[PDB]
Amino acid sequence: AVIKEFMRFKVHMEGSMNGHEFEIEGEGEGRPYEGTQTAKLRVTKGGPLPFSWDILSPQFSRAFTKHPADIPDYWKQSFPEGFKWERVMNFEDGGAVSVAQDTSLEDGTLIYKVKLRGTNFPPDGPVMQKKTMGWEASTERLYPEDVVLKGDIKHALRLKDGGRYLADFKTTYRAKKPVQMPGAFNIDRKLDITSHNEDYTVVEQYERSVARHS
16 A cells, blocks of 8 residues: 555645745645644745735645545545646635645655645735634535546635635546546545744644545
8 A cells, every 4th residue: 555554745835825926845744544634834935924824724635534445535546646636715805716736756755746826815804914713624525527526615714803704615636547436525624723933934734634425
């Protein structure tokens, strides 16, 4: 089995938010069959980011999703070659983010490369004003379409004032070789920022992801 019971990853992200360019480098680890992982990220250009970290946190790992025995694991089967994913996040105030990612495996370590472009965020909105406080627990509804898996999330960020800020995620996952396709299923996820320095230029996050039947 290529994906072992313990695995590490390295991630590099380049992106822009309302024209502000930045770069992130990070490293993570977890237990792919238990669905748990952590990562430590460092802003290496464009810091401190002039926007909420919460936009970036869901972009930093579906190989770490616990699957029941009766749901084929689209992502784990794709290795060693790996998979790609592309995502669009549409926020209720008009902000929009496109993300593209490549996942590979080099010398036993997972390698994540991410490009992100966010536009049209209102200058006084919760993203540019850093008024969000993390993602609510979520369920991604996934379905196969020929050889790819597509997922939809009706998601929400918490606000410092106690309100909510809605976003729709649409993601396509594309294995780099044929795999046994699952039927449609759900992934329940909880993503937390566990630590950060004062200006969010060094951040740690934790995620638990579990696949289940509808």
